[PDB]
Amino acid sequence: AGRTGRRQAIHDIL
Amino acid sequence: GHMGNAAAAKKGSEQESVKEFLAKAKEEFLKKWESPTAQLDHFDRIKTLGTGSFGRVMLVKHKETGNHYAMKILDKQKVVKLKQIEHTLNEKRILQAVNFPFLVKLEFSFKDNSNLYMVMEYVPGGEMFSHLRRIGRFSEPHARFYAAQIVLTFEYLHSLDLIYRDLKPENLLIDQQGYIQVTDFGFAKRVKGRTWTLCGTPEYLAPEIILSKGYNKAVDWWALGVLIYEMAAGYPPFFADQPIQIYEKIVSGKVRFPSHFSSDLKDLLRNLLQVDLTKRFGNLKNGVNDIKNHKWFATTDWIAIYQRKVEAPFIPKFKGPGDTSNFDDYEEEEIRVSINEKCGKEFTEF
Numbered sequence A: 001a002g003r004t005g006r007r008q009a010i011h012d013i014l
Numbered sequence B: 001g002h003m004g005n006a007a008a009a010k011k012g013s014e015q016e017s018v019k020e021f022l023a024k025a026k027e028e029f030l031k032k033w034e035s036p037t038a039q040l041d042h043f044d045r046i047k048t049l050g051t052g053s054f055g056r057v058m059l060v061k062h063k064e065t066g067n068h069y070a071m072k073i074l075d076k077q078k079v080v081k082l083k084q085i086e087h088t089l090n091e092k093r094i095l096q097a098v099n100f101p102f103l104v105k106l107e108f109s110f111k112d113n114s115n116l117y118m119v120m121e122y123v124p125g126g127e128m129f130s131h132l133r134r135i136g137r138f139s140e141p142h143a144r145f146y147a148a149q150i151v152l153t154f155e156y157l158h159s160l161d162l163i164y165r166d167l168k169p170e171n172l173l174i175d176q177q178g179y180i181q182v183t184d185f186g187f188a189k190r191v192k193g194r195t196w197t198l199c200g201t202p203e204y205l206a207p208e209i210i211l212s213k214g215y216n217k218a219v220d221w222w223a224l225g226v227l228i229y230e231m232a233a234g235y236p237p238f239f240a241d242q243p244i245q246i247y248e249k250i251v252s253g254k255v256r257f258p259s260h261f262s263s264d265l266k267d268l269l270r271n272l273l274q275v276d277l278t279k280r281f282g283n284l285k286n287g288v289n290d291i292k293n294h295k296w297f298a299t300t301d302w303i304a305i306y307q308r309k310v311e312a313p314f315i316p317k318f319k320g321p322g323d324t325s326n327f328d329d330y331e332e333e334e335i336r337v338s339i340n341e342k343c344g345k346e347f348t349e350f
């Protein structure tokens, strides 16, 4: 199971 | 040894010629870097081609010439709130100065009271992402054709001390000849050695980013491993519903391969998806040549790829210069321009 749609960038990791 | 006399001398000469090319390319880049153009009402806005965090990309038509372009629109207030000021300045400055056959070309840039604008060549064949999701997976030769273009593009960028940091199929367009165009320089940066920003796309992040190290250009070679795996499998190697679970898989480093992957492909991927930086291909003494000379690329004519003389595996259907049939539909939002300037001091250099 995982993400099949377009994946957005991340600007940080909390 | 592996190569006989003729083959070894040919390869050595080829590698020296790459060095000569890259030295000239650096001279050209630095001249543009040191000594680097429109306005909104010059274009008709047609349709949204894609969206992102800070804004959207629209197909536009230039009024005077009738040429079509892809216009990226960023809202200044949103860029500041997300602390993307320097990244957005990097994006425009780098795009303005590079020149390579697989890097999208920036034609104009400008700003107004509310937004930043970057006007690029329109690439009508659509995102690799769409084509890959539709077909399921690419055969190894098909994946290899695209991978070779990325290898050459990263060899170019890294020679200029540029780190790309957002490789993924969503950012790779297919042009009218079936070749790749890299878009989205939002995280590209001039980096001589280490850098520290936690940024990228979860499935494509190298472990040393997730672990908050002062990492280097080898993160892009890890990302190439992820891309090749996804192209050939149809899904990426570290696959889960939520980012936190994705990160745990990446840091473990355990990779499993579909049974249809060739042994050559698995060997390449184990050397790109390598946690240990002292062992990761693209980060060793032999540099990019460990990748270019790997058995999985043995059939690749690197010069012919650069010259765009290899017949592409797939040619998008082209239905006119402003046709958007290879792109998805997105909700349209009018481009609002405030009567008051926003964030003037932050974006003076743009």
Ligand SMILES: CNS(=O)(=O)c1cccc2cnccc12
Pocket (backbone or CB within 6 Å): B049, B050, B051, B057, B070, B072, B104, B120, B121, B122, B123, B124, B127, B170, B171, B172, B173, B183, B184
């Ligand atoms: C990744 N797809 S997109 O965000 O719509 C995009 C971004 C940047 C340049 C482009 C050029 N042609 C088409 C689409 C373009």
